[PDB]
C-alpha cells in the first residue's frame, strides 16, 4: 500500500523502484492582460523520476508546446506525466523495469494505473512522506536544461553525483532530501550555504559541490539550522 516512515528502508533494497513527482510538469506565471484581466503563461516543466537506490534521475522535459490548444491543463498534466512514465518503462529492458512506482501526490495514482494496465505486476503506490522534490528546479543545472529546451527531451542525471562511492543509498537519500528541503524553505540561504566557500566547486559532470566527508557534515548541519531558523521565523518561536 502506502509508503511511510514504517517501511522506509524498502527504498534501498534490491527491488527496482522509482519515485515520480509531477509538481513541476505544468508551470505558469500569472499576469495581467491589457484589459486588466488575468491570464497565465506556461513555461517549460519537467517530470522528476528518480531511482532512490542508484540516484538515476530520468528528467523528462515538458515543453510548453505540449499544452497548446489543450483545456483543463492541470488535469491533462497528470495524464501526460503518466503517459511519459509509461513510455519510459516500455523503453527500458525488462530487467531494468521497476517493480514499483511510488507517486509523491495521490492524484497521480489513477492516471498512472490506467497507463500501466499493460504492466499488472508493477505496483503503483502512494506515500505518506512529504518529499521535497518540487525543489528540483532549485538545482541550477536542472533548471537550466529545462528552461533552455526548445522541444520535448529526456535528460539523464545522477542526483547523488559520486556520493555512493563513499556513503550508502540510505545516507545519500537523506542528504538529498535535506538539501532539497532547505532549498524549498529558503532557496537563497540554502544556495548561499552551498557556495559560500569559492574553493569548493561543482564539477562539470556533477550537480552539487565537491565536498569532503567532513565538509558535508558542516554543510548538513548548516542546512538543518536553516530549516529550523526558517521554522522559527515562520511560526515565531
Amino acid at each position: 500500500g502506502a509508503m511511510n516512515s514504517s517501511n522506509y528502508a524498502e527504498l534501498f533494497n534490491n527491488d527496482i523502484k522509482l519515485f515520480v513527482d509531477d509538481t513541476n510538469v505544468y508551470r505558469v506565471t500569472v499576469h495581467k492582460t491589457f484589459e486588466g484581466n488575468v491570464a497565465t503563461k506556461a513555461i517549460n516543466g519537467c517530470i522528476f523520476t528518480l531511482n532512490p537506490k542508484t540516484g538515476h534521475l530520468f528528467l523528462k522535459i515538458i515543453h510548453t508546446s505540449v499544452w497548446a490548444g489543450q483545456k483543463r491543463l492541470s488535469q491533462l498534466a497528470k495524464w501526460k506525466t503518466a503517459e511519459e512514465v509509461s513510455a519510459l518503462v516500455r523503453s527500458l529492458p525488462k530487467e531494468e523495469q521497476p517493480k514499483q512506482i511510488i507517486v509523491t501526490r495521490k492524484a497521480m495514482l489513477d492516471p498512472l494505473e490506467v497507463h500501466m494496465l499493460d504492466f499488472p505486476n508493477i505496483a503503483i503506490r502512494p506515500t505518506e512522506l512529504r518529499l521535497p522534490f518540487s525543489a528540483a528546479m532549485s538545482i541550477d543545472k536542472l533548471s537550466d536544461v529545462v528552461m533552455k529546451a526548445t522541444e520535448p527531451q529526456m535528460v539523464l542525471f545522477n542526483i547523488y553525483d559520486d556520493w555512493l562511492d563513499r556513503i550508502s543509498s540510505y545516507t545519500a537519500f537523506s542528504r538529498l532530501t535535506l538539501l532539497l528541503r532547505a532549498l524549498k524553505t529558503n532557496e537563497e540561504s540554502a544556495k548561499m550555504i552551498l557556495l559560500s566557500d569559492p574553493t569548493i566547486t561543482i564539477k562539470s559532470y556533477h550537480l552539487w559541490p565537491s565536498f569532503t566527508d567532513e565538509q558535508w557534515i558542516t554543510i548538513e548541519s548548516q542546512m538543518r539550522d536553516l530549516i529550523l531558523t526558517e521554522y522559527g521565523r515562520k511560526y515565531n518561536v
Binding site: 491533462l76 495524464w79 503518466a82 503517459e83 489513477d110 492516471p111 494505473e113 490506467v114 497507463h115 494496465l117 499493460d118
Partner: protein, 300 residues
Amino acid sequence: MNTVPFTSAPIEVTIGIDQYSFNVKENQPFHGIKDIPIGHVHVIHFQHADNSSMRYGYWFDCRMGNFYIQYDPKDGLYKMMEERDGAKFENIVHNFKERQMMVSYPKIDEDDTWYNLTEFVQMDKIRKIVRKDENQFSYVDSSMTTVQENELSDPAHSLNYTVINFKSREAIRPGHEMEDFLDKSYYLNTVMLQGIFKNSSNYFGELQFAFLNAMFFGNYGSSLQWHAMIELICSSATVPKHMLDKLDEILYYQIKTLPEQYSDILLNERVWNICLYSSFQKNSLHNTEKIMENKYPELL
C-alpha cells in the same frame, strides 16, 4: 392467472412474492399463492423465522411450466419443483382453490410497480446469469457471490453478471487512456452495448435483475453490479437519448420501492452523488433526482 401451490408449510417462514410478503406459522394450513399475473417474471422468496440468516428464493415464469414448493427437511429449505403432469397439477391447484388454502397475489389494478421493476427482465437472461440448466426456474440467495467477486469460490453457485471494471484493458483503448477513463462512452456503447449486451434492453434487464437481487436477498455483489451499471451510463458523455429517459424511469421505480430503512446498506453514497451532481448525466435524471432528494436527502 397462474398458481404456485405448496405441499405444506412445516416451518415458520416469511414468504415473499415479488414486492409482497406474508408470515406463515409452523404447520399452518398454507398451500400456496394464486392469481399470479401472467406476462412477467416473478420471484418467490423465503426467510425462516428461526434463522433470518439466508434469504433465498426462486425466479420463475409461469408460462414456462407448472411449479410448486415443498419443504425438504433434509436440506432444510423450501424448494421449487416442476410437475410435468399437467392434468394432476391442474387437479391439485383446483382442490386447494376450492378449500381456500391459498393467498391471492394482491395486485392493485392501478399499480404498475412490478412491471416497472421488471420491464426488461427476461427469464432466458436470468438463466444465463444463474446457471442450473436442468431447471426452468433460478435459485438465488443472500450469500451467492458474483464471477467478479470470485476473481478478487464455488463456480457452479455464482452469479454470472457481466464484469464491469473501469480500470481494465477492456475499458481503456491504448492511446485513449485519459479520454476513455474520464468519458466512458466507448466502453458503454461499443464494448458493452454493441459488443456484449447487443442492445440496451438486455443491459437494462441485467441492471434491473441485479437491483432486485440486492433488494430481495440483500445480495452484496448484486448491489455492486447495479451501481456499476448505473455509473457506467452516468459517466458516459454520449448516451442515446432514449436510454437516458428510460434509465430515469427505471431508477425512479427502484428508489420508490426500496425500503426506507434499508437505504444505508443498499445505496452507495459515492455513486449516487457522482451520478446526480457531478457526472455527464447530472441533469438527465430529473425523476430520479427528485425522488432521491425527497426520500434520501441524508445520503446526499
